[PDB]
Amino acid sequence: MAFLVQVAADIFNNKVNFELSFPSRPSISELTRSAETAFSNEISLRRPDNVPSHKFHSSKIKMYDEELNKWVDLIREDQLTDYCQLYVFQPPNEWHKESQKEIPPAMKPPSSGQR
């Protein structure tokens, strides 16, 4: 009925995983905008009061390809499959660093940002 993608990232030293819903297979631009919005909302929610406000910026997106059993770059508009798992990197920054903490079961993304 809807096309789902799981999108994971490292936010303040926790691995987060969101289920994003689309009417059909999204474009990479559409997916990227949806993911940046969801992760920016997560940052706003989780931000420690000693950290300045900031947004999530995607730098590279990988997809775990079950056909090849490996992580590959998301480059083409015919790679995404329903309920596939993506991981989104950011450019180097002070607050969010990569970890090999396992990707948790996907949850609905935040419902809003912070007023």
What whole-number distance in Å separates Cα of residue 104 and Cα of residue 45?
18
CB 70 within 8 Å of CB 47: no
Question: Cβ distance 11 to 42 under 8 Å?
Answer: yes
DSSP 66-84: TTTTEEEE--STT---TTE
Of 35, 27, 46, 44, the closest CA to residue 7 belongs to: 35
Contact 32, 58 (CB under 8 A): yes
Determine if residue 13 is left, alpha or beta; phi over 0 gives left, psi from -120 to 50 gives alpha, anything else beta.
Answer: left
List the domains of the chain with CATH numbers: 1-115 (3.10.20.650)
